[PDB]
């Protein structure tokens, strides 16, 4: 029950469901006894920094520049990335309240850390799998449709106050 | 005449370390000359979306989409092949839903696979899960624009009824 010390990403590598994905091997020690390897995508800490965000609005954090969904195998920039997510790590469990925090525990598994020789079974219980990702999607493009809708009927309905509003205002700025 | 209805002929689970269910289907154009084309839920789908796009007015079934309940089942798959089969009936069956730039260029009309070019022509035509997803993202992306955009007009006319409840209730007095 203290400062843990900054997790140590080792490097990565590319692993699959078969569609290829680049994976980070993060070694995390918790006393100079007890040790392990988690693996994380890019998505990952994207997703937990979001919940960050949500969070700890006081305090945020950098992460290297997104892919925006186009490719790069390329020289610096993964490396530039892997750098950028180390720091994203030593500035993570530097914050003494960030630590702590739960989702981050789960992130790096503080609390029910896999064993040696699994760490492919965590990943794959960590990670969204591709249909899993598919339906979050579908579910948001429809969730916005209807919202986008119910915003365009007020926009209506509140411009036509405008002009109600703004008919008496002409009645009463005569009398 | 013209091609008359395809058949599907069957289903294959697939991989790329997602489970994928193929469609074989059969197209005939004159007594001779068969080939095989294969489909998708996913492009049945897209395809009838397309349909929705340009031509409301008339709206073609499909089985129903199962997410988290086993996708492989006995009845399931079953009366997918059946539905799907329907669909492709009522495809071929309609004036101008026979002819079309989306259905010609789903159904092989014109570069039909006839030897193991099917297998081939499965890759090139259909999106696969990471560019199904890659898609979606890029349109969640357009959509989250478009509402900004809304989000900002909606900012704009309740700052201004604000401004006029105001003005009138100075007024009142």
């Known amino acids: 029950e203290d ?3 900054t997790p140590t990403i080792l490097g990565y590598e590319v692993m699959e469901e078969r569609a290829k994905f680049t994976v980070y091997k993060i070694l995390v020690k918790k006393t100079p006894e007890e040790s392990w390897v988690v693996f994380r995508r890019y998505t990952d800490f994207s997703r937990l920094n979001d919940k960050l965000k949500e969070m700890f609005p ?3 954090l950098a992460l290297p520049p997104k892919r925006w969904f ?3 195998y390329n ?3 993964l490396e530039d990335r892997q750098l950028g997510l180390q720091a994203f790590l030593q500035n993570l469990v530097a914050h003494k309240d960030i630590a702590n925090c739960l989702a981050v525990r789960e992130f790096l598994c503080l609390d029910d850390p896999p ?9 794959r219980a960590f990670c969204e799998t591709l249909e899993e990702t598919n339906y979050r999607l579908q ?5 916005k449709q ?10 209506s309905e509140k411009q036509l106050h405008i002009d109600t509003l703004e008919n ?7 009398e």
């Open 70 to 72: 186009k490719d790069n």
């Open 115 to 123: 064993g040696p020789f699994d760490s492919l079974e965590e990943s």
């Open 3 to 5: 400062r843990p010390s």
């Open 75 to 77: 020289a610096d920039f």
């Open 139 to 143: 579910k948001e493009l429809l969730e």
């Open 168 to 174: 008496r205002i002409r009645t009463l700025s005569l």
């Open 58 to 60: 006081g305090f945020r």
């Open 146 to 155: 209807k919202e986008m809708e119910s915003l365009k009927k007020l926009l």
